[PDB]
Design a protein around this motif. Structure first.
Motif, PDB file in Angstrom:
ATOM      1  N   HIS C   9       0.828  -1.201   0.000  1.00 62.87           N
ATOM      2  CA  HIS C   9       0.000   0.000   0.000  1.00 62.87           C
ATOM      3  C   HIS C   9       0.863   1.252   0.000  1.00 62.87           C
ATOM      4  O   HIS C   9       0.577   2.227   0.703  1.00 62.87           O
ATOM      5  CB  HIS C   9      -0.958   0.002   1.190  1.00 62.87           C
ATOM      6  CG  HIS C   9      -0.277  -0.145   2.515  1.00 62.87           C
ATOM      7  ND1 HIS C   9      -0.131  -1.364   3.143  1.00 62.87           N
ATOM      8  CD2 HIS C   9       0.292   0.770   3.334  1.00 62.87           C
ATOM      9  CE1 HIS C   9       0.503  -1.193   4.289  1.00 62.87           C
ATOM     10  NE2 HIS C   9       0.769   0.093   4.429  1.00 62.87           N
ATOM     11  N   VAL C  13       0.674   6.292   0.734  1.00 65.23           N
ATOM     12  CA  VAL C  13       1.697   6.866   1.599  1.00 65.23           C
ATOM     13  C   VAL C  13       2.474   7.910   0.813  1.00 65.23           C
ATOM     14  O   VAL C  13       2.920   7.646  -0.309  1.00 65.23           O
ATOM     15  CB  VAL C  13       2.650   5.785   2.145  1.00 65.23           C
ATOM     16  CG1 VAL C  13       3.784   6.420   2.932  1.00 65.23           C
ATOM     17  CG2 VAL C  13       1.887   4.788   3.001  1.00 65.23           C
ATOM     18  N   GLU C 128       0.106   8.677   5.940  1.00 65.07           N
ATOM     19  CA  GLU C 128      -0.780   7.622   5.469  1.00 65.07           C
ATOM     20  C   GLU C 128      -2.192   8.177   5.347  1.00 65.07           C
ATOM     21  O   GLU C 128      -2.713   8.776   6.296  1.00 65.07           O
ATOM     22  CB  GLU C 128      -0.780   6.429   6.427  1.00 65.07           C
ATOM     23  CG  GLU C 128       0.401   5.494   6.285  1.00 65.07           C
ATOM     24  CD  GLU C 128       0.553   4.587   7.488  1.00 65.07           C
ATOM     25  OE1 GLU C 128       1.128   3.490   7.342  1.00 65.07           O
ATOM     26  OE2 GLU C 128       0.094   4.974   8.584  1.00 65.07           O
ATOM     27  N   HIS C 246       6.008  -0.505   4.415  1.00 62.34           N
ATOM     28  CA  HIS C 246       4.692  -0.132   3.910  1.00 62.34           C
ATOM     29  C   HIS C 246       4.263  -0.983   2.722  1.00 62.34           C
ATOM     30  O   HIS C 246       3.070  -1.027   2.407  1.00 62.34           O
ATOM     31  CB  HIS C 246       4.678   1.348   3.519  1.00 62.34           C
ATOM     32  CG  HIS C 246       4.678   2.281   4.689  1.00 62.34           C
ATOM     33  ND1 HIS C 246       3.737   2.216   5.694  1.00 62.34           N
ATOM     34  CD2 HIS C 246       5.505   3.303   5.014  1.00 62.34           C
ATOM     35  CE1 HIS C 246       3.986   3.156   6.589  1.00 62.34           C
ATOM     36  NE2 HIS C 246       5.052   3.830   6.199  1.00 62.34           N
TER      37      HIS C 246
HETATM   38 CU    CU Z   1       1.659   1.449   5.942  1.00 61.85          CU
END
Ligand code: CU
Ligand code: NAG
Ligand code: NAG
Ligand code: NAG
Ligand code: NAG
Ligand code: CA
Ligand code: CA
Ligand code: CA
Ligand code: CA
Lengths: 463, 416, 265, 166, 161
Positions: C9, C13, C128, C246
């Motif tokens: 993901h 970010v 985020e 992440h």
């Molecule tokens: Cu993350």
């Protein structure tokens, strides 16, 4: 820096041909490096002022279908796209004659012979002009929310008075005039803790008869025949009189008084005097126009012994913890829900009233305040022929199915309503206009039983 | 007092304020003290029951007397029988372009459109005796930062064109001239370093503020009521038809009517969004709230004007301009100066309002010039001393700025 | 019902680190050496703005102030100070669905509308965002739509440079006028090649591409003002490790007593 | 709901006390009750939420010493020369929360927008006028307000109540 | 999260906000009137009324009608679970916009207090109702005999899925 012969101060910017050029350190730096030579499609040709003979404007006096002033004002040459001689731009890249330009109205283009409706008149496009009939018709005074008033002549203001106030009445100057004396009076009650006040009951005194619209019911206080017609259409209760007076009541806080043009200059109260001038609508009961809204409002209280109203506190300042919610809830008036209406009704004052009411609705019933504020703008949109649907199950729902009888499904939500729906009082299915876009639950009678009896509130074959 | 006790009379007692309350009564008769027939209660003075002819009148919270009169700029009213009888008087109209985007027409209608072209402000519809144009151009990265770069006054079918730029330069018939000018049917002068005033013989007057930003105040004689048409309305005392285009219909939004008065085809069509610049920056909003709230502060430097001019619109302009434009102090000072000029036009002087903010312009004029809050006269010059006549319009709305000190005359080299 | 089973993901970010290195939500990595006040990310896709984050640098590309507007709450983060609605607060601090907490390496602000901000002690800011804000944001972190270049570096069919985009994302103070950074010619200047391409980050190469971070490490090594060349590339490596975490990867320890040491209480 | 009205005689909506402990109920029953205690003049006991609750007290001449009103969360105490609202002395006229209290040359009037009017006159008479929406929903010395004089006021359980017992 | 701050004792909602208190009571009296008279012998409305009043007093940040509707719907669900399906929603008291779900030209969705545990859908083609859920009131479809199946994937009446 200098652009088009005009001095550009350091830090300022110019916008030329879609390029933004900022003047920094004595140099004009443009976003994207350098503006490319603009190219105009046929038959428009790019004229530049490099070979600029004296007395030649170039593109500085090139008109369009949107520039309604055909006078050439440019004193010096301006580069740009120019149509062939005697031609104007149509906004789509082509060139047409001036008489063939389409008419423009409310961010829209209409070809020759098209029809638009303003107020009660009809306007036809013809050679860039609008041909409209000159039939006078009604004016609407709208009172809603925490004392938000809009007069007959278009004067918008906010007044918070605790007493009973004369919304409208005739026989003000001279007290004889003609017709029969009528008097619509609003009864107010505090709604909140910041000093705001909203309506509770509406009293209409016509002839020797009195109507009291209170709570959600009507009382005929009374004392000839009753010159009233009470009709429940949509969320609105419509009181029609034979003298030319119509009242729409949303049954909670909103009143819309429609007055025929025969009463121009013969009325007074908090709704103005109906003479097409808005500045003089702040005329006190002493017949003097004042600048203070508080004085003008307080002069129209029924009982002289009632205490005078004071200026209320700012709701979103006295109640900051609600402000965000207000701004999050009234943003419906700026989003895509009412996007089609933004060109026909300005939502600035409606948004301000919505936010203020939501901030001040701190004593119970925020959703009613918000729904009334949004429904004011919704009715304004509906009046000009825009059937915008805004009520969702989360945003001001309407319980239409509550009106469905056992084993039936007829009632449906209508944004613009049904102007001419067949009923017992209107067997032929006639619609007199004069009321537009009364949203709410309307019955859709089946072909088996096509006549709606309001007294029985049911679909029947014959009354 | 002289009231009498009765067993059955209407509870709606007529007073000086409401002399027909008994007729408009819904309750039944009651018992109590009531005024004798032919008299009404005196609620204004609390002097018992008085005849209708002796009733006083109330205006602006001050009680008047039977036969006393008051006057506004537009009307003259007299008290009689507890009611005001008002007669209309000749009344010039005022249009205003403030901040480069805030327009107030001759009929009082207010709107805000950020244009990017040259627009027709005022002009007779059936003639071309005069015409005023405004060059509103985007002067920032975004599309909502508009500056008034020039004002064009055209006279007699463009036979006399005066272009006044935001830098103070004046061009008469495409020739960079020096003020004052006494041209055909027009006289243009500089009452101070902050303002340029142009008066025509057709009943038109232009006040142009150049410091810190270019703002325009147009005044029109009453003889042109209902005849002009442009961005400033038709001057017919009706706000409803001020958005009527040359096509013949009244538009619903300010942007749609605004875009119909462009002068060139290439200019963009402005669409009015619903932005709130103060919400985009915490520090900008704090600065704007701290320095613009003085307009609405009843006990501040501008408190002596709240009765004459309503500061709500000026407060909104101050907030929007301060939060939006890059040079926040310049726009704040422009809004404050616009309010001060409106107050001076109404006859109220607010000298000493630059203490705390907008101090810089007071200390920027040339060596021999000094600042003045009130400049209601014309600059004396050596040529004025010699010839005896000074090129001026004599009567204009008082302005502020840096002028020659008293007893000192402006020499041709810009020195006192 | 929305289904999401991919732990990678990095698209939600955005972060800034090192010598003015910015990674947008869409994966675009650029360098913008601006010392002014800029809009890090704001919710411009709706009539009502849920969040508004701005960051300011000083001079040493170290952040000096972070300004957050989260649903009527104004959070200002300065070195050793947190202000909520203008008043100093003691961490941890919970109010109006906003939780601010300090750790040995970061200051974290979590907003229940679905945003997380992390101001790390390496002078790096990370953000985020929830997937509900896709294609509805603006600022230095992009428009959050998936396409790295479209609608961020294209004003009107024009390819914007990172300098132009960063200057476009400026939001200045009232009385503080700021000068845009002057575009400087390159200085004509491989430690990072060994570690980034080595086995130490191997389990991270398959998830996050290293070319952009290789260039960032080269820039950081060349642009930093002390000859601690071994210890002057810690910021880029830490950012790459953060992006690997992440992305659903499992980075292994790469620090040491002499190579970018970290102290723990 | 459209409700018509033509008869102007509305004595059924008025209850009052006067003179030597003389009481008239909303239904027209006139009786005498020489009680000097604190009694419920009229209250809205016909709903889950009580709109109004008026109590009166007498002191010895049959003078009225205190009138207590609970009107939608507003507490009004009327005594000789004193008007208290929520425990705070007020200056008349006083408007608050839809309740207007005003003194005249012969009376003190409390008007509640929910539909009640109370008059405390200077001949020591307390008169209450109620909206017709409160019919068949009240209790106290002024009766149950249903248009019938004896039923539901002088009957406890099928028996007959003397005015003193009531 | 151990790092999350501990919760403290809140203030009395009707003491901190007395100006709302009356409204709260006047709003929550529905839990004591003829509307829920039949349920009063099967579900005690004491704690539900107290929660209603407290929530209406404390719902001072905006959206008190949602607080009131939730507080009354808790008692309504408690009533419906034990076999009593009372109709309490009115166009002025927590209205439900069932007509929003009607397709253009159709009229199928009706408010059900009892709910319809075994309406016919194509995920339960036979029409068997599983029990284990009682009185889930709200808008339910009444598919016509021409299309006696309700497809929830596309949300309309169809003959078959
Ligand atoms: Cu993350
Ligand atoms: C109003 O007009 C009359 C007659 O012209 C004049 O005497 C009076 O002074 C005027 N009012 C004022 C306030 O001057
Ligand atoms: C001034 O204006 C009048 C009327 O518009 C015109 O007749 C006259 O010629 C003008 N003056 C000059 C010097 O042109
Ligand atoms: C983002 O929204 C814009 C708005 O029109 C649209 O053109 C664009 O295709 C959208 N992008 C994605 C990835 O959905
Ligand atoms: C008053 O209420 C009682 C109690 O139910 C009832 O029996 C009687 O019919 C009611 N009277 C009227 C006029 O409604
Ligand atoms: Ca008028
Ligand atoms: Ca006009
Ligand atoms: Ca993109
Ligand atoms: Ca009885």
């Amino acid at each position: 820096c200098y652009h088009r012969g005009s001095m550009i101060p350091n830090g300022e910017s110019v916008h030329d041909s879609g390029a933004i050029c900022t003047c920094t350190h004595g140099k004009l730096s443009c976003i994207g490096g350098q503006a490319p030579a603009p190219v105009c499609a046929a038959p428009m040709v790019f004229f530049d002022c490099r070979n600029a003979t004296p007395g030649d404007t170039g593109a500085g006096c090139q008109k369009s279908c949107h520039t309604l002033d055909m006078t050439c004002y440019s004193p010096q040459c301006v580069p740009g796209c120019v149509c062939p001689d005697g031609l104007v731009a149509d906004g789509e890249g082509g060139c047409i004659t001036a008489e063939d330009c389409p008419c423009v109205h409310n961010e829209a283009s209409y070809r020759a012979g098209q029809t638009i409706r303003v107020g009660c008149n009809t306007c036809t496009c013809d050679s860039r002009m609008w041909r409209c009939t000159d039939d006078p018709c009604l004016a609407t005074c709208a009172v809603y929310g925490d004392g938000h008033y809009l007069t007959f002549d278009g004067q918008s203001y906010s007044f918070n008075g605790d007493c009973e106030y004369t919304l409208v009445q005739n026989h003000c100057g001279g007290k004889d005039s003609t017709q029969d004396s009528f008097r619509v009076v609003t009864e107010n009650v505090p709604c909140g803790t910041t000093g705001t006040t909203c309506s509770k009951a509406i009293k209409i005194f016509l002839g020797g008869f009195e109507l009291k619209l209170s709570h959600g019911k009507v009382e005929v206080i009374g004392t000839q025949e009753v010159p009233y017609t009470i009709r429940q259409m949509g969320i609105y209760l419509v009181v029609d009189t034979d003298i030319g007076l119509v009242l729409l009541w949303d049954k909670k806080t909103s009143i819309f008084i429609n007055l025929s043009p025969e009463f121009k200059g013969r009325v007074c109260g908090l709704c103005g005097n109906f003479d097409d001038i808005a500045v003089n609508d702040f005329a006190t009961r002493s017949r003097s126009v004042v600048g203070d809204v508080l004085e003008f409002g307080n002069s129209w209280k029924l009982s002289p012994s009632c205490p005078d109203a004071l200026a209320p506190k700012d709701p979103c300042t006295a109640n900051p913890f609600r402000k965000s919610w207000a701004q999050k809830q009234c943003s419906i008036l700026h989003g895509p829900t009412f996007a089609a209406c933004h060109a026909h009704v300005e939502p600035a004052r409606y948004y301000e009233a919505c936010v203020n009411d939501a901030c001040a609705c701190d004593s119970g019933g925020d959703c009613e305040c918000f729904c009334t504020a949004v429904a004011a703008y919704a009715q304004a949109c509906h009046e000009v022929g825009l059937c915008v649907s805004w009520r969702t199950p989360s945003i001001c729902p309407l319980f239409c199915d509550y009106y469905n009888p056992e084993g039936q499904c007829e009632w449906h939500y209508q944004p613009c309503g049904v102007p001419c729906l067949r009923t017992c009082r209107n067997p032929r299915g006639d619609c007199l206009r004069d009321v537009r876009g009364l949203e709410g639950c309307y019955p859709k009678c089946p072909p088996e039983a096509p006549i709606f009896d309001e007294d029985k509130m049911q679909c029947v074959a014959t009354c | 007092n002289n009231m009498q006790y009765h067993e059955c009379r209407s509870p709606c007692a007529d007073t000086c304020s409401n002399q027909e309350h008994s007729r408009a009564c819904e309750d039944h008769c009651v018992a109590g003290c009531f005024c004798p027939e032919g008299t009404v209660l005196d609620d204004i003075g609390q002097t018992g029951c008085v005849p209708v002819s002796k009733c006083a009148c109330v205006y602006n919270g001050a009680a008047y007397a039977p036969g006393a009169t008051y006057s506004t700029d537009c009307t003259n009213c007299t008290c009689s029988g507890g009611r005001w009888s008002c007669q209309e008087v000749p009344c010039p109209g005022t249009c205003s372009v403030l901040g480069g985007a805030h327009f107030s027409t001759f009929d009082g209608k207010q709107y805000t459109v950020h244009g990017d072209c040259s627009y027709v402000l005022t002009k007779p519809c059936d003639s071309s005796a005069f015409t005023v144009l405004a060059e509103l151009r985007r002067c920032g990265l975004t599309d909502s930062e508009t500056c008034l770069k020039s004002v064009t006054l055209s006279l007699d079918g463009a036979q006399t064109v005066v272009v006044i730029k935001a830098s103070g330069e004046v061009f008469l018939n495409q020739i960079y001239t020096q003020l004052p000018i006494s041209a055909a049917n027009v006289t243009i002068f500089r009452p101070s370093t902050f303002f340029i005033i142009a008066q025509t013989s057709l009943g038109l007057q232009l006040n142009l503020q150049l410091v810190p930003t270019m703002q325009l105040f147009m005044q029109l004689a009453p003889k042109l009521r209902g005849q002009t048409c442009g961005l400033c309305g038709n001057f017919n005392s009706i706000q409803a038809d001020d958005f009527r285009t040359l096509s013949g219909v009244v538009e619903a939004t300010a942007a749609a009517f605004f875009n119909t008065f462009k002068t060139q085809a290439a200019c963009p069509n402005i669409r009015n969004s619903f932005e709130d610049p103060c919400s985009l920056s915490v520090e900008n909003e704090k600065y704007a709230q701290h320095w613009c709230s003085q307009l609405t502060d009843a006990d501040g430097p501008f408190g002596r004007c709240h009765a004459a001019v309503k500061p709500g619109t000026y407060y909104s302009n101050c907030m929007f301009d301060t939060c939006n434009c890059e040079r926040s102090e310049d726009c704040l000072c422009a809004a404050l100066s616009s309010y001060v000029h409106a107050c001076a036009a109404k006859g109220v002087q607010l000298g000493g309002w630059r203490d705390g903010v907008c101090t810089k312009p007071m200390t920027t004029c040339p060596k021999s010039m000094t600042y003045h809050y009130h400049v209601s006269t014309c600059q004396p010059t050596c040529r004025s001393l010699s010839e005896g006549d000074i090129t001026c319009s004599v009567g204009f709305i008082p302005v502020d700025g840096c002028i020659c000190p008293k007893g000192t005359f402006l020499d041709d080299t810009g020195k006192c | 019902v929305v289904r999401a089973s991919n732990p990678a993901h990095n698209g939600r970010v955005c972060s800034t680190w090192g010598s003015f290195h910015y990674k947008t939500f869409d994966g675009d990595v650029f360098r913008f050496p601006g010392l002014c006040n800029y809009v890090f990310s704001e919710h411009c896709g709706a009539a009502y703005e849920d969040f508004n984050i701005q960051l300011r640098r000083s001079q040493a590309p170290t952040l000096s102030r972070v300004l957050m507007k989260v649903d009527g709450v104004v959070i200002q983060l300065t070195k050793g100070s947190v202000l909520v609605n203008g008043h100093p607060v003691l961490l941890p601090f919970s109010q109006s669905g906003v939780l601010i907490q300090q750790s040995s390496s970061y200051t974290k602000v979590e907003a229940r509308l679905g945003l997380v901000l992390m101001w790390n002690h390496d002078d790096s800011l990370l953000l985020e965002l929830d997937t509900k804000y896709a294609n509805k944001t603006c600022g230095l972190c992009g428009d959050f739509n998936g396409m790295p270049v479209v609608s961020e570096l294209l004003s009107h069919n024009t390819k914007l440079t990172p300098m132009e985009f960063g200057n476009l994302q400026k939001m200045d103070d009232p009385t503080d006028q700021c000068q845009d950074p002057v575009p400087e010619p390159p200085r004509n200047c491989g430690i990072c090649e060994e570690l980034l391409h080595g086995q130490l980050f191997s389990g991270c190469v398959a998830l996050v591409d290293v070319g952009s971070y290789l260039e960032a490490c080269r820039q950081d090594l060349c642009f930093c003002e002390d000859t601690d060349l071994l210890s002057c590339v810690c910021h880029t490596l830490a950012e790459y490790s953060r992006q690997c975490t992440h992305a659903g990867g499992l980075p292994q320890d790469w620090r040491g007593p002499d190579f970018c040491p970290q102290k723990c209480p | 709901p459209v409700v018509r009205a033509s008869n102007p005689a509305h004595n059924g909506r008025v209850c009052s006390t006067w003179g030597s402990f003389h009481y008239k109920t909303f239904d027209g029953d006139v009786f005498r009750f020489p009680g000097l205690c604190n009694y419920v003049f009229s209250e809205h006991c016909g709903a889950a939420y009580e709109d109004f609750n008026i109590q009166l007290r007498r002191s010895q001449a049959p003078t009225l010493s205190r009138v207590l009103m609970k009107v939608d969360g507003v507490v009004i105490q009327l005594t000789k020369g004193s008007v208290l609202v929520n425990g705070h002395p007020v200056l008349l006229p006083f408007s608050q929360s839809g309740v207007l209290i005003q003194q005249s040359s012969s009376y003190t009037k409390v008007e509640a927008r929910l539909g009640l009017v109370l008059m405390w006159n200077h001949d020591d008479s307390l008169l209450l006028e109620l909206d017709t929406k409160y019919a068949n929903k009240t209790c106290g010395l002024c009766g149950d307000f249903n248009g019938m004089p004896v039923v539901s006021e002088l009957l406890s359980h099928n028996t007959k109540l003397t005015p003193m017992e009531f």
